[PDB]
Enzyme design. Structure first.
Site, short mmCIF file in Angstrom:
data_model
loop_
_atom_site.label_atom_id
_atom_site.label_comp_id
_atom_site.label_asym_id
_atom_site.label_seq_id
_atom_site.Cartn_x
_atom_site.Cartn_y
_atom_site.Cartn_z
CD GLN A 24 -3.00 -1.03 2.20
OE1 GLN A 24 -4.01 -0.40 2.04
NE2 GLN A 24 -2.76 -1.64 3.32
NE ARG A 82 -1.16 -2.43 11.93
CZ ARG A 82 -1.75 -3.10 10.96
NH1 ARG A 82 -1.85 -4.36 10.92
NH2 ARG A 82 -2.32 -2.44 10.01
CG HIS A 128 -1.02 -6.13 5.35
ND1 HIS A 128 -1.18 -5.31 6.44
CD2 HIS A 128 -2.08 -5.87 4.56
CE1 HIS A 128 -2.30 -4.61 6.32
NE2 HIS A 128 -2.88 -4.95 5.20
CD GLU A 174 -8.24 -6.31 7.89
OE1 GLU A 174 -8.71 -6.50 6.71
OE2 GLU A 174 -8.43 -5.26 8.56
CG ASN A 308 -6.89 -4.88 11.92
OD1 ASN A 308 -6.23 -4.72 12.98
ND2 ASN A 308 -6.32 -5.16 10.77
CE1 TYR A 310 -10.31 1.04 8.97
CE2 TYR A 310 -10.24 -1.40 9.30
CZ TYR A 310 -9.59 -0.17 9.02
OH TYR A 310 -8.23 -0.16 8.82
CD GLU A 375 -5.56 -2.34 9.60
OE1 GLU A 375 -6.69 -2.23 9.03
OE2 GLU A 375 -4.59 -2.84 9.00
CD1 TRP A 424 -6.44 2.16 7.24
CD2 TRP A 424 -4.53 1.10 7.79
NE1 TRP A 424 -5.81 1.80 6.07
CE2 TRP A 424 -4.64 1.13 6.38
CE3 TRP A 424 -3.42 0.50 8.36
CZ2 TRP A 424 -3.68 0.55 5.53
CZ3 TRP A 424 -2.46 -0.10 7.53
CH2 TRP A 424 -2.62 -0.09 6.12
CD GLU A 431 -8.59 0.71 1.56
OE1 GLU A 431 -7.45 0.89 2.15
OE2 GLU A 431 -9.43 -0.18 1.95
CD1 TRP A 432 -6.58 -2.87 0.67
CD2 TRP A 432 -4.93 -3.81 -0.54
NE1 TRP A 432 -5.51 -3.15 1.52
CE2 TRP A 432 -4.50 -3.73 0.80
CE3 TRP A 432 -4.08 -4.39 -1.50
CZ2 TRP A 432 -3.25 -4.22 1.23
CZ3 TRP A 432 -2.80 -4.86 -1.08
CH2 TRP A 432 -2.41 -4.77 0.29
#
Lengths: 468, 469, 469
Positions: A24, A82, A128, A174, A308, A310, A375, A424, A431-432
């Site tokens: 990333q 991290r 990752h 993840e 993590n 969100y 995250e 994060w 972002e993928w």
């Protein structure tokens, strides 16, 4: 009043930090001897899978700009950072027979040295999602049990090279997301399942991810921990699951099952050495079995667990596929009222109480003795029309971080032993599947001008409110 | 058969090349001492005016990558390369009292020396829209007659520093576009007219563009041309204007008027020292007047004229003040549901190869220009971020477009037009102004994901094989 | 006996230092990405406004010679060093959309790191008159309330980049001088008022200076001070005002009014949130009004106040609109043919050491400031290009001047003024604004014939021996 939350609300040794992952941010995808990962291959061969058709060849160029990242981290004044190691950067062919890349090792050593020189603790993730393409091509990467020994040899290389300085390791980040979007939805590298089988492959991949983790933790604990005196854990994807109707026994069960399928799927194995009951029942013969040696290696295989977090959803009862195996329907609204407002992403609904609840749930269900939030964060509304000074006023992020950090403190009052928190992300980055349009950073990136870093309002608040 | 067109269809000394402009490719916008231009300011303060909100801070980084561009030009094998000097790179404050930037001059010296070391002729344009912000801020840039002396000092600096090696100069590129989009539509820097007045400002700006051009040609001819033995001209925007109805006297007049308002606006002054009749009539007291000394300096103020050409339109008679409405025409794309030509990747660019033959013949007939270059001709790729490089580089549409237009240039030369060379637009995919980076004109593909990596498209390879040496 | 004054006459933690400002010493005016300030533009376009027609393009080259300045400060052995950041060096276009200049930030990091590596405390002023030309051109700089937000973004940039090491900040230096000479006399950049209006513009400019200061202090206190644990203040121009006749009630009032118009203009707003009464009365509707939120932000907006002091004047009551005439006083240098003090090398600087004691006591009495620094005090050498270095470095007049003033500061502290430190102006001979290089304030001599070679004057050596460590 979450707007007042600060370091004085936390124990003296509590760790604050920020995060990134190699693919990333680094770029230098073909620089300094790095070999390709499956994300190189996915973004280059299938650019239709990425918003804007972009990729991580350059990303935000932290490969060359790492000294500025370290300088930003110093100015930010938080305790820890991290980041992840790109497997195919240190081992371009994934396995030792593909060669050991000294210049890749030197990059991580320089990054670690710059961090420590500035009083910043490195928290390092081995994996990752950036599986070396050579391993993907030779035997199908995490589809094959051969991945386990290759991952152990990579882990051992990193402990040997960096473990004198890195005292906090995470095997995987993840694995849920890697498994489900890689092999159920086919939305992420290697892009299978949408040739693939969403009913079988996600379970094999998760099984091998677990075995890789357990084997790497065993290796660390037996071969490095006594001499290096570090700690090893793992980071898991979470999302809070609330019963759509608080008084429906069926919805309470459905929400628990959605937690089993997402979190339990990884947490029960490292707790009792088996999968969740609800998974054994609904998945049946398509769910692999651990041998008694594997179960023993898995049970208690961590020094800490990172979570993590969100967002959150309501849950109600609902070709094989992972999605349908869960036997739930997700709901965003009760009577027209969303569980929370959207961020710049329609899937990220802001529900700060969810992080308190996931932490309480994790301690209650799995009795984890040490937890980090590895995250937590939120993305800006998309708007290429804003100048830097307007773009950097990230008051939705600022409130988001405050409310979540407040909720982490509430979980600690409830009895959860949380030892730190990592926002994060440090930098806006790749972002993928969404490419660069989705900005998570506390630090703004100017993609028009060599990825120039500039702190957002949330960064400045973090420094002033949490610097020791 | 245009697919067969090659160097052997042209005179031995015919010049083939490719082009760029400073703001579109260089980047290094604040590197090496460069001062801001009005396009820096426009893209930074008004990113809503640009598709994707991008800018020229880095562009395709030819500021640092110039050696690689030279190596590509060498491999391409064409005779010449047309680029512009950024005024605020050599003079960051526009006028001499803002300082002379030695590093900026060093950059253009290095580029010129690399070009010559590889047998490539530099064709150099002084002004391609990047007005120093310092001049824009101090007195309104081209809105002020002060621009003329400042542009002369800048021209003289460039002739002094570079003229021992650069023998082909252009004062201005497409002053039509600069004037109309800067001051009538407000779509380009400095973003006025959409505080601005589309009925008056375009005519003042063009009047001063013309005076700057004439003054810089006079300076070159009187002060440099004997010792340096180069040539100086100017490049103009053109589009072919066809009567919507071939047999309507009214539509014939309307097309001619549309030609007067776009090309005659600049060509008549350098031909007879005045504006077109139709402009004087329709613009009236809002059209500035040349003094007799200004007319004398303008008349015959060139050694060559460059034409830029892309597309064509049908024209008919039209149905408070503004340049667009002063023309009194309506543009039409179709006769009976049949477009004049198919679209490129842009809905405004309709492919009409015969139009470049017609604009050449028209220019020679109307203005009796003795030496002409096509300084721009090219076409943009369909927008598609889904393609890998090997799919993206197969630019069959461009390959056809170049062949058909080059064929038409050769037809114009048979008709009697003295064309001395032809320059594709563009060498590199680059910053396409208000459309940002999504509009690719290059014969060389740019990988924006990976440090602007250059890779020749099919059209580049055909150009080398068919037109080299 | 002031000749005996030393460190042992002061508290253990008393801070001694020396000063400079960015435009006066740095040079590198177009080097390392720096954008122009209004002083670049003023000196370049109006060199008749400067003695000798010189400018700050190179100055004394502390931009390249900073390591040598650090080495001199180390040898000098005083605790601290006061310098300013050039706004247009870190932000060439003034606002964030003009770009952030990493090399400019790198320069101040290198200077700060050298200073700390040698045990020297940095005292850093954000604004010392070098307004980015881009802001001046876009909206008139300090004439516009837009300046306040832009100055806040610039302040925040500096706190973010430097505040982990810089613990003593000053928003502004001598906003009085900036306002009066920029907008009333037109003698300093931007050269207005001599197109300008000396009756209105100085009051708008000061109003915005005050709002910028208050807003930047609020930003530091709310967003940085807890994490960085530094202090922020402001430096003001002062001159002692003595009644011409000690027993004339009228002259006593006139001196107080002259103090109100120079120092109260800035001090009363940060004390009570309003201007002095005498200013409201004599300026009337031309004096802008603070909103209640603006008054609340201004009142108590400092952790310390710096005072700058040079000279003194007698004052008597005076005998279309303009700041100078609004004060309604007449300045007098002599009582009965006896000047208030002898001249330095400048005819306006009369040496009156007791005046620094009086301005300290006055400031504490009138505004009850709890922590004060003398941020400037010094004297200029007689002009004489005939002297060799060894004659030129014997600066007996400066040596006496410093001793007598430092002695007076110590007297003010006995009277009850909490003075925390003292900074000589200046470390280096430098660019003295409208007087150019002929006016030497340095304790370190500059050889302008030989790459600005530094050499300590007698006063530097006395300072080291008497005040080190």
């Amino acid at each position: 009043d979450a707007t007042r939350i600060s370091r004085s609300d936390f124990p003296a040794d509590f760790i604050m930090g920020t995060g990134s992952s190699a693919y990333q941010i680094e770029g230098g995808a073909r620089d300094g001897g790095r070999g390709p990962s499956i994300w190189d291959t996915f973004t280059h061969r299938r650019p239709d899978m990425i918003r804007g058709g972009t990729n991580g060849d350059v990303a935000v160029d932290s490969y060359h700009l790492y000294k500025e990242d370290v300088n930003i981290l110093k100015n930010l004044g938080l305790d820890a950072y991290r980041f992840s190691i790109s497997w195919s950067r240190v081992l371009p062919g994934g396995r030792l027979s593909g060669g050991v890349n000294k210049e890749g090792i030197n990059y991580y050593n320089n990054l670690i040295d710059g961090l420590l020189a500035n009083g910043i603790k490195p928290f390092v993730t081995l994996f990752h999602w950036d599986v070396p393409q050579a391993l993907e091509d030779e035997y199908g990467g995490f589809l094959s049990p051969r991945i386990v020994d290759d991952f152990c040899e990579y882990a051992e290389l990193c402990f040997w090279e960096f473990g004198d300085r890195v005292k906090h390791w995470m095997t995987l980040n993840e694995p849920w997301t890697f498994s489900v979007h890689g092999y159920a939805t086919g939305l992420y590298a290697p892009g299978r399942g949408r040739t693939g089988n969403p009913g079988t492959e996600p379970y094999w991949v998760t099984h091998h991810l677990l075995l890789a983790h357990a084997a790497a933790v065993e290796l660390y604990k037996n071969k490095f921990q006594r001499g290096q005196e570090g700690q090893i854990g793992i980071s898991h994807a979470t999302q809070w699951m609330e019963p759509w109707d608080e008084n429906s026994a069926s919805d309470v069960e459905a929400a628990a099952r959605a937690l089993d399928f997402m979190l339990g799927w990884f947490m029960e194995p490292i707790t009792s050495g088996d999968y969740p009951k609800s998974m054994k029942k609904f998945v049946g013969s398509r769910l692999p079995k651990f041998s008694p040696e594997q179960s023993k290696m898995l049970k208690g295989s961590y020094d800490f667990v990172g979570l993590n977090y969100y967002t959150a959803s309501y849950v109600t009862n609902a070709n094989f596929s992972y999605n349908t195996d869960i036997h739930v329907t997700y709901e965003t609204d009760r009577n027209g009222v969303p569980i929370g407002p959207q961020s710049g992403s329609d899937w990220l609904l802001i529900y700060p109480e969810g992080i308190r609840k996931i932490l309480v749930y994790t301690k209650k269900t799995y009795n984890v003795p040490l937890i980090y939030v590895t995250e937590n964060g939120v993305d800006d509304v998309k708007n290429t029309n804003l100048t830097l000074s307007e773009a950097r006023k990230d008051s939705m992020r600022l409130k988001y971080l405050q409310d979540h950090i407040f909720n982490v403190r509430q979980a600690m009052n409830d009895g959860v032993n949380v030892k730190g928190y990592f926002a994060w992300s440090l930098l806006d980055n790749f972002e993928w599947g969404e490419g660069y349009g989705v900005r998570f950073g506390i630090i703004h990136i100017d993609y028009n001008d060599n990825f120039a870093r500039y702190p957002k309002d949330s960064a400045v608040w973090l420094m002033n409110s949490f610097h020791k």
